[PDB]
Amino acid sequence: ALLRILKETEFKKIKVLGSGAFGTVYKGLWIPVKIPVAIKELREKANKEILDEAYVMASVDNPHVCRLLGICLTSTVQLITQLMPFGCLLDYVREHKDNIGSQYLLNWCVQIAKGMNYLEDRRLVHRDLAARNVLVKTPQHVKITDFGLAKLLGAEEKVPIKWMALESILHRIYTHQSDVWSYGVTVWELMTFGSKPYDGIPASEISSILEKGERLPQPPICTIDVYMIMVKCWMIDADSRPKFRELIIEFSKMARDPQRYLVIQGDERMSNFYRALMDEVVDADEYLI
């Protein structure tokens, strides 16, 4: 079964990871061997529609995209997926604000770009792409998660405002090109090692400054070449923004000569922590082999 219907006794929530905008995520074990998993319990028979979108979250198959392993429909709804041992990309760059070289930064951009392009091939608009919604399987590989939920929970029926495209803020219009805007902010978050976008500025005034032409500032380590891509992602005209397929090629090219596009001191010179962090056993990987 592509979307496993887990019985309440099959898994157990052990600790709290964090509270999101759609629900609370827990880390735990899945006993079909014990499999370390992340369990998302949504905030609030209608499960028919839920199972439908849930299916999409489970049918994705790409190395840069998280896959839903199962669902549990009791009073509330619980989504179960493989636990990403390094947590989310946002906290990761924050913690390693130093020891992170241009090679990693660019490789992540490529990876996230591949994941988004893949979702575009499945005609799936993410709607909530951000550094906090990118997981770290290993420092070498990251994966996009949390897609599908926005739509499911009524994102386009009568608020990540700082990651949203102008058209999304004003008209609830979400397309693959609105995802490209969010992609731009996500990249900005990486390059600034986790800065908060438009920090300080009130959400209600964002559409206003965007219309004025204001955009997130050029990250210190970025050559104007990398920043132009970010700016191009934030164009009012959605069709003028880069395509994920083009972003893949551009960031991949930049990844061949990282020190030419990103200027970080000591770039060249650039485990137990996450064990004591996440450890409460076979990877969902081995088990699902």
Ligand SMILES: CS(=O)(=O)CCNCc1ccc(-c2ccc3ncnc(Nc4ccc(OCc5cccc(F)c5)c(Cl)c4)c3c2)o1
């Ligand atoms: C970064 S911050 O300062 O803003 C706050 C920190 N964020 C809280 C946090 C820390 C760590 C995690 C975390 C760590 C490991 C994880 N491993 C797997 N999944 C995680 N989250 C998650 C996201 C979505 C989920 O269901 C929806 C979905 C949609 C598409 C595909 C899918 F596979 C799943 C589930 Cl079940 C878990 C996770 C979070 O969340």
